RNA sequence: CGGCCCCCUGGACGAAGACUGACGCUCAGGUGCGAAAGCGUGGGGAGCAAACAGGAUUAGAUACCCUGGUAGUCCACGCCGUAAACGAUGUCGACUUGGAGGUUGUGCCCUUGAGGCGUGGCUUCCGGAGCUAACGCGUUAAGUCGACCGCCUGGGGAGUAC
């Protein structure tokens, strides 16, 4: 999993209040970081299918979040995707 | 009638050999949780400890072996 | 005063060491031409005896049915085992439009005017039972009023 | 997921009737409340009571006459999967007039008879008998 | 008529263990002390009174009461109760279809009566020893089974019961015919067949006796009326 | 099941003790079990079946017991 | 009203769970069944053998009051565990009384050691004590007139498992079971143990502070196979038993009774 | 999926709070994972063992039994894409009497003791109403309802041919 400190850092940056944590953008960021982390793992361990399932799920969740953001508020979404470097 | 619930131990210790020895057979085998009446959660831990001990030659795997 | 109709009589067998022992089942239904109906299912080695038994059974454990004039009070479904039955109240003159066992029960009950289809199974015994159930459940306007805490004119 | 609240409410009511429960509670909604009111008017329930500010709970008080339940039958007709709208001439008669059909019309939710009287049809919510 | 204090003393308020309960007795239960169910005496008493009243009323119109209790602890007591108010009873095993199948059981009763007559009024004696013994045995059997109900004639107009779960057959029979039922119903029992349920301890002897006695009194009163 | 004959102990007694020890060990039983390969499925089946049997013995029979035989 | 609620908490206040409050009045006697009513849901089926004192005949008629015991409710129909154990608590209280003045005095008469301590019997009950407790010194009551009268001066008690060895003559002088399971071990230490349940292969006598013994069917008597242990000994009775075997590992102490 | 240890790693549950504010449910096509056997290339090969051989048994014995025994089972990386892949029971949500357990949290309580009173998650058995052709299911529904999808339309021919 993502280390506590790292998570906190992520929250602080993206979250407006820094105590917020549940902001859509923040959540997305958290997901994204985790995904990035797991890439390294999965390069090594290609047959770790069970673990990869979780990763996939996370990705899906992130996508959903992004979609939600888009309909609600476009500018914010755009900003987020610039920050994280998500192609979509 | 579990011992570890009453003592209130956080984790069973493989080093605590004497304690282990009560839960092991004359033939070396780990004694069932029916007989000892150990709680399930603790029982597993105990087993693990015993195994560890066996690896460290603190407890024997069996009576015959040498 | 009571009218009684033997719906069906069926020969049923029991296999024994020797061979087959045969017997007869009689399904009857009785009614007073008003609300009261009762079916009876009797069994014996000979037919007439069986029929008699059935009749006897019928005569006890009768059941009352609220009848608005010659017909039913509203469309009513009744089910029992395979036989599921629909019966619908109908205008004076139309007669009992219903099939088989179902018809007989209606006739004794003193419904004169119905539109009634038996869906599913048409196994006489089951279908008569279903019909009876339907009749039984069927509530009157007065009854409904009583239930709801209203007058009959409030319900219409 | 929860897709049909009215339907759920109806189901709850039915279950209460079955199980000889005195009162049946659920999360409140305006439509639901209206329905409850209608039922009360038509005399299928004793009383309804909404309670709460943030997340209010509608509590119906079920009725029992001579042991058995009052609400003999209660079905949704319109449902999210397949909506039913009737014109004032096409409005039904539940149990040949002895039961009622809750119908939502432009002039609020009402019984079928009421709607007919008014001279307007609408979305048929539920039959109650 | 019967007070609450007296009932308490008797041990009416005690019920069965919580695992053996019926959830249809949840209204009549108060609480659970030491993992044993306590019957609510506030709800019991009025019901009991009502039942008593009903019984009295029945008596007044010359009603035939039947007292059923085949527990074997309170077999002695129920018989006594029956006899005090000269009513009928079934203190030993209820014959399956005693009431529903009366017409067959009426023959049995007749036979028993005949046997009794032979024993007593005849004064003939001079009988083969084995045969005589057999006859005696038969008589004993009959007496045990149908002693209380031999003078009942027809069917009873009400049915008092000491345990509903134990005498369910009797209760069922009474429902099929439509005879009013007055059952003492502990927490384990089912009250649905019973017309005039009495929430109370079927098992305890003193309680049972108490239940009997009041009923007997009421019957007597009715008779007097 | 290692055993040593005590001083002034009878032979028969010793033998009995040994037997008891063996029984406790469940050595013979173990040997019997490992004589032939049991498919996993079969093993599972036996275990569950046995459990079921045990359950039946415990509860149903207890229920029966409540009612007298004669 | 709340009359009943208050009456309920009142009746809670005026009873307790063990056999403590002497409350059941003996309301029917018939051999071989006594029966009381201590304010419980049902009446006890009491044996007659929890109530005859020291020579075999009954002592209590109608109206008499002994407490029984509790904490076990409904086996189908009925209420209690026996009042005789009740008595054990009273015995414990008298034994405890010693502590106050460092000397409990009654009569103790101990002829011999089943398992290394003379047996002492107080009133109806007889208890077994470790070998030292019988005599203050090396006096030995084997030379004393048989079943002699002294008292008991306590030597040793085991505090969990109930074994008490007491001091005859010499008036002037004044986890848990299984680690150290070597006390009653060595080959044949006789014990006094109450049997619990006889499982048609066994008898299950088990007394010594949370253990389990069997005395299964083979010994029990001097007939092997046709015996059926329910016929031959008892239910709930303190008997002659000794160990014959301990496994401290697969907790099976395999006692015997043919000795 | 089962010895023990370490490294990397996914999910579940509980405890309180704090936050986000319908972001949800289902899903034709699509994508992935998918026992055993089987295939490819390269390793490995103790035991077991299709095939095969011999010895029995038998009327025969291309079987069962016995003695041997090679693919295979084992590892790496690919493919295969099926099984009584079963709870023969799609997924998600709501509601409706009870009892006896197991397991894993957690709150209070003199833990005066292995306990006492609750409250959550997953789970085994029995059984009520109801349901069911019956068998049975029964708060983990096969009950009472809603949302979406998948699938069935007499047996064979055939899950075969093209």
Coordinates of N, CA, C and O (backbone and C1' of nucleotides) in Angstrom, one line a residue, chain D residues 1-4 7-8 11-12 14-15 19 21 76 79-82, chain H residues 24-26 92-97 128-129 143-148:
Chain D
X1 N -28.8 -1.7 -6.2 CA -29.1 -0.4 -5.6 C -30.6 -0.1 -5.4 O -31.4 -0.7 -6.0
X2 N -30.9 0.9 -4.5 CA -32.3 1.3 -4.4 C -32.7 2.1 -5.6 O -32.1 3.2 -5.9
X3 N -33.6 1.6 -6.4 CA -34.1 2.2 -7.6 C -35.5 2.8 -7.6 O -35.8 3.8 -8.3
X4 N -36.4 2.1 -6.8 CA -37.8 2.5 -6.7 C -38.2 2.6 -5.2 O -38.4 1.6 -4.5
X7 N -42.1 1.8 -4.4 CA -42.2 0.3 -4.5 C -41.8 -0.3 -3.2 O -42.4 -1.2 -2.7
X8 N -40.6 0.1 -2.8 CA -40.0 -0.4 -1.5 C -40.9 -0.2 -0.4 O -41.1 -1.1 0.5
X11 N -43.8 -2.5 -0.4 CA -43.3 -3.8 -0.1 C -43.2 -3.9 1.5 O -43.7 -4.9 2.0
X12 N -42.7 -2.9 2.1 CA -42.5 -2.8 3.5 C -43.9 -2.9 4.2 O -44.0 -3.7 5.2
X14 N -46.6 -4.2 3.0 CA -47.1 -5.5 2.7 C -46.6 -6.5 3.8 O -47.3 -7.3 4.4
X15 N -45.3 -6.4 4.0 CA -44.6 -7.3 4.9 C -45.1 -7.1 6.3 O -45.3 -8.0 7.0
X19 N -46.8 -9.8 8.7 CA -46.2 -10.2 10.0 C -46.8 -9.6 11.2 O -46.3 -9.7 12.3
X21 N -47.2 -6.5 12.2 CA -46.5 -5.4 12.8 C -47.4 -4.2 12.9 O -48.2 -3.9 12.0
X76 N -47.4 -2.0 -6.9 CA -47.0 -0.9 -7.9 C -47.4 -1.3 -9.3 O -47.5 -2.5 -9.7
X79 N -43.5 1.7 -12.7 CA -42.3 1.4 -12.1 C -41.1 1.9 -13.0 O -41.4 2.0 -14.2
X80 N -39.9 2.1 -12.4 CA -38.9 2.8 -13.2 C -38.6 2.1 -14.5 O -38.3 2.8 -15.5
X81 N -38.6 0.8 -14.5 CA -38.4 0.0 -15.7 C -39.4 0.3 -16.8 O -39.0 0.3 -18.0
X82 N -40.7 0.5 -16.4 CA -41.8 0.6 -17.4 C -42.9 1.5 -16.8 O -43.7 1.0 -16.0
Chain H
rG24 P -19.6 5.9 -9.7 O5' -20.9 5.5 -8.9 C5' -20.8 5.1 -7.6 C4' -22.2 4.6 -7.1 C3' -22.7 3.3 -7.7 O3' -22.1 2.2 -7.1 C1' -24.4 5.0 -7.9
rC25 P -21.6 1.0 -8.0 O5' -22.9 0.2 -8.4 C5' -23.8 -0.3 -7.4 C4' -25.1 -0.9 -8.0 C3' -24.9 -1.8 -9.2 O3' -24.6 -3.1 -8.8 C1' -26.5 -0.2 -9.7
rU26 P -23.6 -4.0 -9.6 O5' -24.4 -4.3 -11.0 C5' -25.7 -5.1 -10.9 C4' -26.3 -5.0 -12.3 C3' -25.4 -5.5 -13.4 O3' -25.5 -6.9 -13.6 C1' -26.5 -3.4 -14.0
rC92 P -23.8 -9.2 -5.4 O5' -24.5 -7.8 -5.3 C5' -23.9 -6.6 -5.9 C4' -24.8 -5.5 -5.9 C3' -25.8 -5.4 -4.7 O3' -25.1 -4.8 -3.6 C1' -27.0 -5.0 -6.7
rG93 P -25.7 -5.2 -2.1 O5' -27.0 -4.4 -2.1 C5' -27.0 -3.0 -2.0 C4' -28.4 -2.4 -2.1 C3' -29.4 -2.9 -1.0 O3' -29.1 -2.4 0.3 C1' -30.5 -3.0 -3.1
rA94 P -29.5 -3.2 1.6 O5' -31.0 -3.0 1.7 C5' -31.6 -1.7 1.8 C4' -33.1 -1.7 1.6 C3' -33.8 -2.6 2.6 O3' -33.9 -2.0 3.9 C1' -34.7 -2.9 0.5
rC95 P -33.7 -2.9 5.2 O5' -35.2 -3.6 5.3 C5' -36.4 -2.8 5.3 C4' -37.6 -3.7 5.1 C3' -37.8 -4.8 6.0 O3' -38.4 -4.4 7.2 C1' -38.2 -5.5 3.8
rU96 P -38.2 -5.2 8.6 O5' -38.9 -6.6 8.2 C5' -40.3 -6.8 8.7 C4' -40.7 -8.2 8.3 C3' -40.3 -9.4 9.1 O3' -40.9 -9.6 10.4 C1' -40.3 -10.0 6.8
rU97 P -40.2 -9.3 11.8 O5' -39.1 -10.5 11.9 C5' -39.4 -11.9 11.7 C4' -40.2 -12.5 12.8 C3' -39.5 -12.9 14.1 O3' -39.1 -11.9 15.0 C1' -41.0 -14.6 13.5
rG128 P -41.0 -26.0 10.3 O5' -41.3 -24.5 10.8 C5' -42.1 -24.2 11.9 C4' -42.4 -22.8 12.0 C3' -43.2 -22.2 10.9 O3' -44.6 -22.6 10.9 C1' -41.6 -20.6 11.6
rA129 P -45.4 -22.7 9.6 O5' -45.6 -21.3 9.1 C5' -46.5 -20.4 9.7 C4' -46.4 -19.0 9.2 C3' -46.7 -18.8 7.7 O3' -48.1 -18.7 7.4 C1' -44.7 -17.7 8.2
rG143 P -38.7 -17.4 -3.5 O5' -39.6 -16.9 -2.3 C5' -40.7 -17.7 -1.8 C4' -41.3 -17.0 -0.6 C3' -41.8 -15.6 -0.8 O3' -43.1 -15.6 -1.3 C1' -40.3 -15.6 1.1
rU144 P -43.4 -14.8 -2.6 O5' -43.5 -13.3 -2.2 C5' -44.3 -12.9 -1.1 C4' -44.0 -11.5 -0.7 C3' -43.8 -10.5 -1.8 O3' -45.0 -10.1 -2.4 C1' -42.2 -10.2 -0.1
rC145 P -45.1 -9.9 -4.0 O5' -44.4 -8.5 -4.2 C5' -43.3 -8.3 -5.1 C4' -42.6 -7.0 -4.8 C3' -41.7 -6.4 -5.9 O3' -42.5 -5.7 -6.9 C1' -40.5 -6.4 -3.9
rG146 P -42.1 -5.8 -8.4 O5' -40.8 -4.8 -8.5 C5' -41.0 -3.4 -8.3 C4' -39.6 -2.7 -8.2 C3' -38.7 -2.9 -9.4 O3' -39.0 -2.1 -10.5 C1' -37.5 -3.1 -7.3
rA147 P -38.5 -2.5 -12.0 O5' -36.9 -2.2 -11.8 C5' -36.3 -0.9 -11.9 C4' -34.9 -1.0 -12.0 C3' -34.3 -1.9 -13.2 O3' -34.4 -1.2 -14.4 C1' -33.2 -2.5 -11.2
rC148 P -34.8 -2.0 -15.7 O5' -33.6 -2.8 -16.1 C5' -32.4 -2.1 -16.7 C4' -31.2 -2.9 -16.5 C3' -31.0 -4.2 -17.2 O3' -30.8 -4.0 -18.6 C1' -30.3 -4.5 -15.0

